[PDB]
């Protein structure tokens, strides 16, 4: 079960391969590669991105509220007189 | 030993003519064999075998056959 000699029992399968020296290292990396990457990105965009956008909104508001708190209070001095 | 009998000789005649056009006599083979030397064998084998790209084919319970990169790496020595 841990040696290539005996791992599983398969039947009726064929495989075809070519030598590394008989083929290009970057085949269709301009017409077929980029579109596949775009498919990958698009297929998982809405599953991740939006949550991290919420994080950014929480981060900005926080900082804004923190600084907003340190501003002096005109309502604590109107009557101080 | 292959040429014993009349069938092997006629087959040799027919096959040899189609390729060479002439029946190369046996005495000519021995002359060419004598030219063979250890230096000659090494040069020719290095010419046609060393660091080449083999073709492979396996029909069997073959899960342990090394991948093509393992075989291609075994086509040459690093000690050499
Ligand atoms: C002249 C101009 C040439 C421009 C070339 C641009 C294309 C470059 C390219 O061919 O990339 C492969 C890529 C194809 O990738 P793929 O094999 O189909 O999918 C798997 C990926 O390769 C990714 O999978 P991978 O297995 O092939 O490689 C993954 C690898 C990273 O693989 C990389 O590509 C790294 C960047 C090397 C770029 C080399 C470019 C050579 C050309 O990452 C690792 O395995 C190691 C991770 C270690 C993390 C350590 C973190 C430390 C902190 O080419 C493309 O078609 C997409 C390129 C997108 C360009 C967008 C441009 C918009 C304008
Ligand atoms: C400095 C230049 C050193 C050049 C190599 C000298 C030794 C060559 C040799 O005997 O095999 C080494 C063997 C030569 O490469 P290979 O023929 O492609 O390896 C085929 C095996 O798959 C390689 O499989 P492996 O990596 O597991 O190696 C196992 C075994 C090869 O596996 C065997 O089947 C044993 C065959 C022994 C034949 C050599 C008898 C020497 C007498 O090779 C040895 O352990 C040789 C040990 C010799 C000790 C001599 C002590 C004298 C005192 O592996 C290496 O050590 C690479 C050496 C490449 C040059 C140095 C590169 C880094 C610097």
UniProtKB/Swiss-Prot annotation, chain A:
Localization annotation: Mitochondrion inner membrane
Modified residues (Phosphoserine): 15
Disulfide bond annotation, renumbered to this chain: none
Topology within the bilayer: Single-pass membrane protein
Segments crossing the lipid bilayer: 39-67
Any one of the GO BP annotations: cellular respiration
Record topology, Mitochondrial matrix segments: 1-38
Protein name as it appears in the record: Cytochrome b-c1 complex subunit 8
The keyword Transmembrane appears for this protein: yes
SUPFAM superfamilies hit by this protein: Ubiquinone-binding protein QP-C of cytochrome bc1 complex (Ubiquinol-cytochrome c reductase) (SSF81508)
Cellular component annotations (GO), alphabetically ordered: mitochondrial inner membrane; mitochondrion; respiratory chain complex III
Species of origin: Homo sapiens (Human)
From Swiss-Prot, chain B:
Domain of life the protein comes from: Eukaryota
Compartment(s): Mitochondrion inner membrane
Summary of the tissues where the protein is detected: Expressed in brain, including substantia nigra, striatum, cortex and cerebellum, and in spinal cord, heart, kidney, liver and muscle.
Disease: Parkinsonism with polyneuropathy: An autosomal dominant disorder characterized by late-onset, levodopa-responsive parkinsonism with asymmetric tremor, rigidity and bradykinesia. Patients also manifest a sensorimotor polyneuropathy with variable degrees of distal legs and hands muscle atrophy and weakness, and absent deep tendon reflexes.
Family: Belongs to the peptidase M16 family. UQCRC1/QCR1 subfamily.
Complexes and interactors: Component of the ubiquinol-cytochrome c oxidoreductase (cytochrome b-c1 complex, complex III, CIII), a multisubunit enzyme composed of 11 subunits. The complex is composed of 3 respiratory subunits cytochrome b, cytochrome c1 and Rieske protein UQCRFS1, 2 core protein subunits UQCRC1/QCR1 and UQCRC2/QCR2, and 6 low-molecular weight protein subunits UQCRH/QCR6, UQCRB/QCR7, UQCRQ/QCR8, UQCR10/QCR9, UQCR11/QCR10 and subunit 9, the cleavage product of Rieske protein UQCRFS1.
Record's function text: Component of the ubiquinol-cytochrome c oxidoreductase, a multisubunit transmembrane complex that is part of the mitochondrial electron transport chain which drives oxidative phosphorylation.
Official protein name in the record: Cytochrome b-c1 complex subunit 1, mitochondrial
Source species: Homo sapiens
Parent sequence residues shown: 401 to 480 of 480
